[PDB]
DNA sequence: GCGTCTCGAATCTGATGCGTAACTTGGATGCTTCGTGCGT
DNA sequence: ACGCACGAAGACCAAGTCAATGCTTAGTCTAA
């Protein structure tokens, strides 16, 4: 992190006066008398996610040319890309000696060999192949403690 | 030679010379090995602020006098303005005498550079106190000696100031108003790099020496960091 | 497809930052306990790294407008300026699920979670409006990726770029505006003023007595109308750059974006409706490096196809498409 | 709907800027501690971006009138000259809470926090007066977008546009005025003047002795006496101003109400300085959606005829029940 | 209610602007440091916007009389001509605090922090005098708007309108008057002249020798003696002035009191220069809501009879009880 | 038809007070289920 | 005649914080 993490705040709300006007004019078919900001169609919601300035470095085994070509079309990193978070100023792909840092800092399968693991590995539930948010694909896996 | 800066990425060029944002294309920087390696910087820093005080002139004159005594051959002392040179030439003339030659309002590269070239070939070990004009354009390569590695007509050179705010164009004032003090610092970095352009104008130079004379580089003030980065490319003299 | 919109705000832009922050009369943010403190609603500032004061890197706050606010503003502009009139022209009516999906992408209409067939995804992601803003019970991935409204400032050089260096502002761009609320009863001066009040002089006397008693009790240890406070806003006249990208856009979607940009000037940015904050005028719109902003709005020979496509889409648009998208 | 009002102030406009400021007798703001300083209440200035002939954009102060202050001015003008006379013609009475909410937007400092029904929102936003300002115990979004009072100045050219350049003023438009308070007892000169004072000579002697003792104690140390000498900063008279009013999808009744307010606005005053007759102004031109609708009589013409008819009908049908419903707390 | 008073000054008007300004002996204001730097007390001027015939908005100074000075002049006129005779006949004596509050708007420099009850506000705002002049420990808004005394000049045409073009003056209306103070002892040059001073000629010789020593020491260095040479800048005599007094919703008695003051206002001075008989003026015309109500005798006519009558009964029923209530502290 | 001399000089060259007061010193919302009954 | 409206209700502990940015000094002549 080039700077401390910033807690970013975003909300969600349907304009109640605009909806009332549409309800009056027949654009909206709602018979309910009042909006409910606590829940339902007109719920106001408050959520937060952290924003960080960072340089993304990771290690892999593959083709330099093809990986560089794939990363050429990448414009945004991480998530919340619809609101423009994590634009890519640039990228670099370099060949480095194996002794620097291994590719093991990831979700390895449960019975992975100890010799290839860099550092401590805590057992947890995570997916081994992308997509990683699919909870039906979640399996017990060794997740690096010094990276989570 | 001063298009791309260390961190500006030629933005100053695109702004000074207005170019459409899409029409401009940058190029990677290049530098031959014989441009940075064959020179070492002496750690003889200046102990006084580069003002116009007579005592600062005395100390700088003594430092550059011992440099000239130690100088291998023809040397160049980079003076920013006529005010500093005139304040400095009086002390030098006591020891150097005729060996020192300085620009005037009339004296310039019309004949002074030719005279310096002739005197250097004569073995006088001449000292050229450049003022503004000598900062850019004039040639200090011993073209006749086609080794080419002679490194004697400009064996040594000394800088008296960074400099700071040499450009006085109203466009520069507009730019410094728009962007702040950052632009003038990197413009002075450009000027300092331009002054180093006098050091080499032929390939295969082998051994030259450099002196820095400004207490600001030794005062550890935050804004001279780009100058530190620029001079850090050059190995210091192991004194 | 990259859209670069150069926005200059005529009036100050006020995006309220969460939190209870205080200020003193002299203007000191978060004054110490010694002096009086007044509540302050600061502008939305994002911590960014920049070369401030010839430093290598400084994490200085930059007053911006959140990207989600810009996204919602664009959605509201489309809805209130092209989509809603087009649906009204057909006398279309939307259920609560379809309307919630259309105006906030809320899945309340069918929170069960509906599968989407590949043909359905192809048809719907090609919708001129709902494709750009995914959501609803289906909850697709929208084709619109709008950036935050970063001001053209010295600290935003590494976020905006150096293409618009001529319009940058060196100093701070935030100013504190003080508000005040006065009790109308204390400003009565004659029985003619109190004629409209049903209680006349007696009601005003009771109101003032209650106010005095409450104030005395509060001093010794129900809140009245009187209030003094300030809110921080970004100074007017500063130029802003808005970057919009549409991933794999159809002609209809680009036409809709151009129409929204045409009608965007009539809307406001962020908050401040009471004080007419956020008013702005579009200065330049850039499509894939080509300037398109004419003095009469977005026009030109290179955008007629988008306008024709979006007009054709508006001609044949029906509420049934919204219902199908919202699974209603 | 965009309304642009062109205002030239007959008397200087003085809007107090919060915070303590000091000035010396010469006129130097925030003088060095060595010189004598006097309290100063500066005219409120909002930082704005101004472009010059050099092309550089810089932040400079600009003396303006806050949007909130003259929004309240417009509300008070409407209530005093259009709404309240209409209510009093039919002998309609408002409760103290209804009056407080009509004049300030709330009956108390604690909002209800309960959402309003859709039909109530539509009815209130269709009200000629309540629709413009909204507010109430349950926050209702008003239709009136009202802007601050920007003087037509070289600094405000970027803000107010270049179509009013003919009325711009180049130099500074701010001047400082000094005020003094005198102890009346120090101007007594005969027992006839002190004959009306109870006790007379004894009372005056006690007052002067106490004043001298207090001043001597204050001087040696290095309540408050009547003597005072300070200054307050005002905007010079004769400068033109631009007022911009926007309404979100206005009904004809609300447009007519705003036009009537503009007709009756000249009798009111913009900012503070009631004793010094500050804030007096005359409206020069009113622009409605890019069209001038101002005559020497005022807002008039067939273009504004329908707005006036609609607002007259609404006022004839205007009752206190709407205000009582609007200001009724949901709790 | 608008009242316009046309005032012409018989003698020069001298309202001194605070600040130390210097003038050379040839009339140049703020000369170079090389020349002499005699002190000057300039007349107070407010910058105003005026057209020089080309329609350009040029900010130029204008020698005026402060509005606060005129307000206090009107207050003093009413008190010393109307209120004081009325209270005296009934043997009603104001307390020292009531006297100070009436003559200065406050009995001390620390106003109360609590608002006043509505009954008190109604009673005070209806009072013939206290209603016009607000103030007191509880900040109360008065009914009087006193404007500055703007001279009818080409620069003030934009401010005061084009109604008084025939009375406008083009050239500068400001002049410098030189003042010198002599040391009496130096002029004393007879043994009979010194026959009154104790010690005879010895005291005069000691005075002269002390003066010589002091001036020699001060010149060598490069108290203060009696010798002086100064200058004060005054507005020339004979120019016409426009005075605007505006009152919001007045009772009959208050307007009657204002008219009574205007009848007896000419006997007072405008501002400053008591020793040199500065500030003398004569009222040319009084405009009452667009109608001239000024007779050669004074404020008279069939139109204004009811105001005078009403203020007459108001004075007859007046007492000191309301003054004591107004000036009483609420803490 | 001019006529020239003289065609200034010294000295003052500011003093004193006042040189803030009171009050506001935030307020509200951001949850779904469950039972019972309308109800279009 | 299943769908939607609408109040009551049930979890219920509970702090420490609230800046993030200051910085200097005169040569050019090679188009009217």
Numbering used by the authors:
A (entry chain F): 75 to 222
B (entry chain K): 480 to 718
C (entry chain A): 1 to 221, 237 to 343
D (entry chain B), E (entry chain C): 1 to 222, 237 to 345
Sentences from the study reporting this entry:
Type IV-A CRISPR-Cas systems diverge from this general mechanism, using a nuclease-independent interference pathway to suppress gene expression for gene regulation and plasmid competition.
Inspection of the cryo-EM 2D-classes for the type IV-A1 DNA-bound effector complex revealed an additional density on its belly side. Structure reconstruction revealed DinG at resolutions ranging from ~3.5 Å to ~7 Å, which could be unambiguously assigned to the helicase domains (HD1 and HD2), as well as the FeS-like and arch domains. The structure further revealed the complete NTS path from the PAM to the exit of the helicase. Examination of the DinG interface revealed interactions involving its α-helices 19, 21, 27 and 28 and the wrist loops (WL2) of Cas7.1 and Cas7.2, along with a loop extending from the palm domain of Cas7.1. This suggests that the interface formed by the HD1, HD2 and arch domains is crucial for DinG recruitment and subsequent transcriptional interference. The conformation observed in our structure when complexed with a native DNA target might represent the initial DinG recruitment state, prior to the sliding, or pre-sliding state.
